[PDB]
Design an enzyme around this catalytic site. Structure first.
Site, PDB file in Angstrom:
ATOM      1  CE  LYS A   1      10.823 -30.805  37.496  1.00 36.89           C
ATOM      2  NZ  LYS A   1      10.714 -29.526  38.247  1.00 36.89           N
TER       3      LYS A   1
ATOM      4  CG  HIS B   1      21.425 -43.594  43.651  1.00 36.84           C
ATOM      5  ND1 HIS B   1      22.483 -44.279  43.073  1.00 36.84           N
ATOM      6  CD2 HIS B   1      20.818 -42.835  42.703  1.00 36.84           C
ATOM      7  CE1 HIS B   1      22.478 -43.929  41.790  1.00 36.84           C
ATOM      8  NE2 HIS B   1      21.497 -43.056  41.523  1.00 36.84           N
TER       9      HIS B   1
ATOM     10  CG  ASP C   1      20.098 -50.205  38.102  1.00 38.98           C
ATOM     11  OD1 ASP C   1      19.943 -49.356  37.201  1.00 38.98           O
ATOM     12  OD2 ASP C   1      20.144 -49.917  39.335  1.00 38.98           O
TER      13      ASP C   1
ATOM     14  CG  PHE D   1      21.479 -57.760  48.117  1.00 44.35           C
ATOM     15  CD1 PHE D   1      20.951 -58.420  49.216  1.00 44.35           C
ATOM     16  CD2 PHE D   1      20.678 -56.852  47.448  1.00 44.35           C
ATOM     17  CE1 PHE D   1      19.636 -58.182  49.630  1.00 44.35           C
ATOM     18  CE2 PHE D   1      19.365 -56.618  47.861  1.00 44.35           C
ATOM     19  CZ  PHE D   1      18.854 -57.283  48.950  1.00 44.35           C
TER      20      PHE D   1
ATOM     21  CB  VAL E   1      20.897 -60.644  45.710  1.00 43.49           C
ATOM     22  CG1 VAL E   1      20.389 -59.614  44.697  1.00 43.49           C
ATOM     23  CG2 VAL E   1      19.853 -60.911  46.797  1.00 43.49           C
TER      24      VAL E   1
ATOM     25  CB  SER F   1      24.683 -51.958  37.561  1.00 43.17           C
ATOM     26  OG  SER F   1      24.529 -50.566  37.309  1.00 43.17           O
TER      27      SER F   1
ATOM     28  CG  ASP G   1      18.467 -41.964  34.405  1.00 47.88           C
ATOM     29  OD1 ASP G   1      18.490 -43.179  34.074  1.00 47.88           O
ATOM     30  OD2 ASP G   1      18.802 -41.549  35.546  1.00 47.88           O
TER      31      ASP G   1
HETATM   32  C1  LIG Z   1      16.568 -41.866  40.834  1.00 52.34           C
HETATM   33  C2  LIG Z   1      17.826 -42.618  40.408  1.00 52.34           C
HETATM   34  C3  LIG Z   1      18.857 -41.768  39.672  1.00 52.34           C
HETATM   35  O1  LIG Z   1      18.345 -41.341  38.431  1.00 52.34           O
HETATM   36  O2  LIG Z   1      19.943 -42.652  39.474  1.00 52.34           O
HETATM   37  C4  LIG Z   1      19.281 -40.554  40.501  1.00 52.34           C
HETATM   38  C5  LIG Z   1      20.308 -39.622  39.855  1.00 52.34           C
HETATM   39  C6  LIG Z   1      20.930 -38.700  40.909  1.00 52.34           C
HETATM   40  C7  LIG Z   1      21.815 -37.558  40.413  1.00 52.34           C
HETATM   41  C8  LIG Z   1      22.470 -36.775  41.546  1.00 52.34           C
HETATM   42  C9  LIG Z   1      23.416 -35.645  41.128  1.00 52.34           C
HETATM   43  N1  LIG Z   1      24.256 -35.239  42.239  1.00 52.34           N
HETATM   44  C10 LIG Z   1      25.500 -34.788  42.048  1.00 52.34           C
HETATM   45  O3  LIG Z   1      26.017 -34.705  40.937  1.00 52.34           O
HETATM   46  C11 LIG Z   1      26.222 -34.368  43.314  1.00 52.34           C
HETATM   47  C12 LIG Z   1      27.669 -33.885  43.267  1.00 52.34           C
HETATM   48  C13 LIG Z   1      26.574 -32.909  43.500  1.00 52.34           C
HETATM   49  C14 LIG Z   1      26.239 -31.877  42.421  1.00 52.34           C
HETATM   50  C15 LIG Z   1      24.853 -31.283  42.615  1.00 52.34           C
HETATM   51  N2  LIG Z   1      24.697 -30.670  43.973  1.00 52.34           N
HETATM   52  C16 LIG Z   1      23.336 -30.093  44.150  1.00 52.34           C
HETATM   53  C17 LIG Z   1      25.011 -31.670  45.048  1.00 52.34           C
HETATM   54  C18 LIG Z   1      26.405 -32.260  44.879  1.00 52.34           C
HETATM   55  C19 LIG Z   1      22.643 -34.446  40.673  1.00 52.34           C
HETATM   56  N3  LIG Z   1      21.941 -33.585  41.479  1.00 52.34           N
HETATM   57  C20 LIG Z   1      21.350 -32.646  40.671  1.00 52.34           C
HETATM   58  C21 LIG Z   1      20.514 -31.533  41.167  1.00 52.34           C
HETATM   59  C22 LIG Z   1      20.218 -30.448  40.349  1.00 52.34           C
HETATM   60  C23 LIG Z   1      19.429 -29.408  40.808  1.00 52.34           C
HETATM   61  C24 LIG Z   1      18.946 -29.476  42.081  1.00 52.34           C
HETATM   62  F1  LIG Z   1      18.153 -28.461  42.531  1.00 52.34           F
HETATM   63  C25 LIG Z   1      19.215 -30.517  42.925  1.00 52.34           C
HETATM   64  C26 LIG Z   1      20.008 -31.551  42.460  1.00 52.34           C
HETATM   65  N4  LIG Z   1      21.644 -32.868  39.395  1.00 52.34           N
HETATM   66  C27 LIG Z   1      22.440 -33.985  39.386  1.00 52.34           C
HETATM   67  C28 LIG Z   1      22.908 -34.598  38.179  1.00 52.34           C
HETATM   68  N5  LIG Z   1      23.282 -35.126  37.235  1.00 52.34           N
HETATM   69 CA   LIG Z   2      25.717 -59.833  45.382  1.00 50.50          CA
HETATM   70 CA   LIG Z   3      22.389 -48.963  36.096  1.00 49.41          CA
HETATM   71 ZN   LIG Z   4      19.571 -42.378  37.038  1.00 50.97          ZN
END
Ligand SMILES: CCC(O)(O)CCCCC[C@H](NC(=O)[C@H]1CC12CCN(C)CC2)c1nc(-c2ccc(F)cc2)[nH]c1C#N
Ligand SMILES: [Ca+2]
Ligand SMILES: [Ca+2]
Ligand SMILES: [Zn+2]
Length: 368
Positions: free
Chosen positions: A25, A135, A168, A181, A187, A191, A258
């Site tokens: 969001k 990512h 991170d 990197f 760098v 994490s 998060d």
């Molecule tokens: C900004 C930095 C960050 O905070 O690190 C990013 C975190 C990314 C999390 C990705 C994760 N994706 C997955 O778990 C992949 C394996 C799937 C499951 C979900 N489906 C929608 C895709 C495949 C995920 N996707 C979703 C999601 C839920 C509803 C939706 F309408 C669309 C997506 N939830 C999650 C989690 N946890």
């Molecule tokens: Ca490195």
């Molecule tokens: Ca991290």
């Molecule tokens: Zn995250």
């Protein structure tokens, strides 16, 4: 002492919408801004509106074809790009939405503009809460990220800094930045993340870099329920050892919220004070610092977290009682800045935390 802080924000950022049901969001960036304005944090901070980063600026890392695709795709023409969408991983996690490219331009613009300001020695700290999209890969969107503003900001810092440290604290492994990197020693990527049956699946303790980059990638894998006490037990000793051995001249800190207790997608138990203790630790080294956003899916807590971290950057004490603001009702039933940890069990035993720290210390002994 107290440092000069430059803050990057575009008033349109909060209007970008990933779609119904998507946990990302952009409105949380606007909530953060409104809360920090209502606390009076604008009085000692220089506020800038980032420029819209060009396709050319983005191709300093991403492929020409990937950036051309991002610049061209829209919900109305999606049907003609089914092939490129699969190739670039545009789908449920990274959907096509109105203004997608402009959103990437503003997120990236803040990070690159902050890096330029630091390079010119015109600020001690630069803050871009719209950045930290760790990512994204060279030719692939991933985990709600399309353009890696972090990699681009680091490339900018590398023009004037021989060694740059990336830290991170998002609950998810910073895979895009680590990968970019992985084979260089200019760098060092550090994490701290949940590891084990968790997105993105990378960041094992044993992933330490390759070729010239061997020992320049550090990964601290954690289990569910880590608290302020446990996180504090290892963050300062690890960062102090990294500072001592690596001697970076600039730092980029991804502040993904998060990792806070009660996050919609996260499984950690940090409070805003515990999370902000990381910013306090990094700030103590007195190096040029670029602070960025990232994850954070319980948006009232994201706003509390980044408002408090901006206050930390400025060395300004702010009261626990929240001032009245445009989103006041989102902060009930308490209307306080600080949060309480939950009763979740901390699966990270003190012995586990010390054991992983000792293995990371062995790897850090291998640096020149
Ligand atoms: C900004 C930095 C960050 O905070 O690190 C990013 C975190 C990314 C999390 C990705 C994760 N994706 C997955 O778990 C992949 C394996 C799937 C499951 C979900 N489906 C929608 C895709 C495949 C995920 N996707 C979703 C999601 C839920 C509803 C939706 F309408 C669309 C997506 N939830 C999650 C989690 N946890
Ligand atoms: Ca490195
Ligand atoms: Ca991290
Ligand atoms: Zn995250």
């Amino acid at each position: 002492g107290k440092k000069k802080v430059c803050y990057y924000y575009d008033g349109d950022i909060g209007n970008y919408y990933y779609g119904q049901g998507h946990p990302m969001k952009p409105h949380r960036i606007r909530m953060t801004h409104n809360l920090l304005l209502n606390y009076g944090l604008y009085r000692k901070m220089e506020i800038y509106r980032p420029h819209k980063a060009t396709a050319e600026e983005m191709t300093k890392y991403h492929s020409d074809e990937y950036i051309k695709f991002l610049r061209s795709i829209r919900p109305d023409n999606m049907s003609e790009y089914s092939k490129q969408m699969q190739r670039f991983n545009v789908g449920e996690d990274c959907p096509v939405f109105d203004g997608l490219f402009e959103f990437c331009q503003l997120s990236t613009g803040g990070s690159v503009a902050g890096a330029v300001k630091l390079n010119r020695q015109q600020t001690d700290m630069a803050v871009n809460w719209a950045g930290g999209l760790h990512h994204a890969k060279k030719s692939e969107a991933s985990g709600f990220c399309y353009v890696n503003d972090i990699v681009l900001a680091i490339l900018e810092l590398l023009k004037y800094h021989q060694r740059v440290l990336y830290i991170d604290i998002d609950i998810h492994h910073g895979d895009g930045v680590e990968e970019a990197f992985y084979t260089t020693d200019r760098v060092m990527t550090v994490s701290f993340h949940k590891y084990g049956e968790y997105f993105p699946g990378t960041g094992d303790l044993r992933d330490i870099g390759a070729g010239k980059g061997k020992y320049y990638a550090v990964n601290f894998p954690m289990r569910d329920g880590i608290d302020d006490e446990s996180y504090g037990q290892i963050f300062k000793p690890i960062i102090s050892k990294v500072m001592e051995m690596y001697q970076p001249s600039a730092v980029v800190l991804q502040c993904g919220a998060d990792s806070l207790s009660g996050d919609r997608l996260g499984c950690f138990n940090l409070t805003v004070k515990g999370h902000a203790k990381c910013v306090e630790v990094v700030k103590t080294f007195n190096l040029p610092l670029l602070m960025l956003g990232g994850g954070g899916y319980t948006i009232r807590n994201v706003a509390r977290c980044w408002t408090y971290e901006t206050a930390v950057a400025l060395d300004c004490e702010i009261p626990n009682e929240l001032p009245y603001n445009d989103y006041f009702e989102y902060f009930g039933p308490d209307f306080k800045l600080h949060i309480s940890p939950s009763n979740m069990t901390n699966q990270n035993t003190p012995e586990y935390m010390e054991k992983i720290k000792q293995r990371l210390f062995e790897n850090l002994r291998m640096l020149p």
